[PDB]
Amino acid sequence: TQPKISLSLHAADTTIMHRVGMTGLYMTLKRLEKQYPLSRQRGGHISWFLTADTIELFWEGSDFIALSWLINESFQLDDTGLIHLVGLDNDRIDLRQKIHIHEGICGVFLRLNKFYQAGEIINTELRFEEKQVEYQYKSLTWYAHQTFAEKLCEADTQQLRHDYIQ
DNA sequence: GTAGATCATGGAATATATCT
User: Fold this and answer.
1) DSSP letter string over A14-57?
2) Nearest nucleic acid nucleotide to A117, CA to C1' distance
3) Helix%, strand%, coil% for chain A, nearest 5
4) Which parts of the protein come within 7 Å of strand B, by CB position?
């Protein structure tokens, strides 16, 4: 069907950050079709067509629910409070690297508490060479990434905005 | 009712005789 969202690497207006975000979209949708191969498991019956340098999106019904499902599935938080990005393969990533990436992302992206609410400081004593070093980190509860869908879509029409967004 | 100012909210070589 017609693309409500069209994205190409060859577009002139894009910058480097837009391209790396495009790659992030590509990998998270790859991991989603690995997790949800079938159409009706995908919220809002989203359908993505992926090429070497193009990502293509169609869905059914109102946009708000579709992007809400996409965002909620994309960014998640495990029980330990660490970041859970489906684009990266968390299964074969150990807990130390998970702590590394979570600490990095709160230290560079979520640098401000106006965008995220943190949990309790969770300390775990991981065992290396008969040494239980206590890894101490601040767990999270919510962040603006999980709820950017409200800003992305119009409030009244529950559809994507047709103007520039601050 | 809205725009500007304020406040919260952060993680842990010479002389001499001679010729003319």
Assistant:
1) --HHHHHHHHHHHHHHHHHHHH--SGGGSGGG-EEEE-SSEEEE
2) B10
3) 35, 30, 40
4) A 106, 112-114, 118, 121, 136-138
Q: Which positions on chain B have an atom < 7 Å from some protein CB?
A: 8-12
User: What resolution in angstrom units was achieved for this structure?
Assistant: 3.1
User: Shortest CA–C1' contact from A111: which nucleotide?
Assistant: B10
Experimental approach taken: cryo-EM
Please answer whether residues A36 and A49 qualify as being in contact, where contact means their C-beta atoms are separated by less than 8 angstroms: no
Kind of pairing between the strands at A131-143 and A116-128: antiparallel
Question: Å between A26 CA and B7 C1'?
Answer: 42
Residue A11 token pair? 């577009």
Q: Are strands A75-77 and A83-85 parallel, antiparallel or unpaired?
A: antiparallel
